[model samples]
Target: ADLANGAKVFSGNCAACHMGGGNVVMANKTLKKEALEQFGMYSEEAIIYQVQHGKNAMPAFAGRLTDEQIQDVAAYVLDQAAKGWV
Candidate 1:
């Protein structure tokens, strides 16, 4: 699914706050990223939904990036987390 490419995409756009492995460390897990599987982010479809619509502090990526790009990022995050993004 080209998860690595998605990781790169996330790094360029979302990683500024999400950081590595999608954790917003300084927020004490309060403002953490979903890739940690904390917000039921168990599948690519789930990630895509969250990305397209967003939740809490996270804004929707509908206008920010293309659907395929978002999909790539989602898949990438899933892959990275599976291997330990820390």
Candidate 2:
């Protein structure tokens, strides 16, 4: 249920841009598989901060999503970042 809820929320909110296959092209940034590998050279703490607070074109979830939701989404996002989203 947790992953299902998080996936639903993510698709409703983030999938519009980041997408599952990572084919989206946006000004802010793209989340394609290759990009994440290089990005992973950094710490995830910053990613979580951005997810909560957002940066540039990315909107901050903050009050919109609960803390648990944030972690759930982060888990999925990290998964997608590491593997090619199906």
Candidate 3:
């Protein structure tokens, strides 16, 4: 997986709200495996879709980021989730 690009993308696009996998606005919703699983977002497809389509306060990244970058972010998030994003 392209973790380098994923990390960069996350820092620029998602870190504002999901810093280190924690949600700033929603305390219950995070990028952690538990939160993701609890919200049925523990899959690459789900993350990809969410990143592409805006959800609630989350803005869509479909236009801001390329498809490959989205996939990379998804992969990176999954990998980080598995590792607990420490």
Candidate 4:
């Protein structure tokens, strides 16, 4: 996946609420590695599904973002989580 495009996608769409992998909406439900693991969302499949379908307060990106963009963003999330969003 193109992480460069992923980063761009994240900045334009997700960063409003998930800046730095931190969830501004829910303090404990962040995109951080530990949080993702604890919430059973540490996998790309899980992330992709969530992005495409929406969950809780998170909106679906299925129509707004292309499938490839979703995949890229999922990869980006995992990459950032691995790097501790540093």
Highest-scoring model, lDDT: 4
Off by over 4 Å in 3: none
lDDT of 4 by residue, 26-73 (tens): 889889999999989999999999999998899999989999999999
Task: Write candidate 2's Cα lDDT for 1-86 as tens digits.
Answer: 26666677788878887766453655335564566556561234555677799866778999999887877776666666665566
The clash numbers for all candidates, in the given order, read 1, 0, 0, 0
- Tens digits of per-residue lDDT for model 3, 1-86: 69889888888889899988999998789899988999899999999999999799999888889999999999899888999875
- For candidate 4, the clash count comes to 0
Q: With candidate 2 superimposed using the best TM-score fit, by how many Å does residue 57's alpha carbon deviate from the native?
A: 0.9
Tell me each candidate's RMSD, in Å, in order.
3.3, 3.0, 0.9, 0.8
Task: Report how far off residue 62 is in candidate 2 (Å).
Answer: 0.6
Order of candidate numbers by TM-score, starting with the best: 4, 3, 1, 2
Q: How close is candidate 2 to the true structure, as a TM-score?
A: 0.72
For each candidate in turn, the TM-score is 0.77, 0.72, 0.94, 0.96
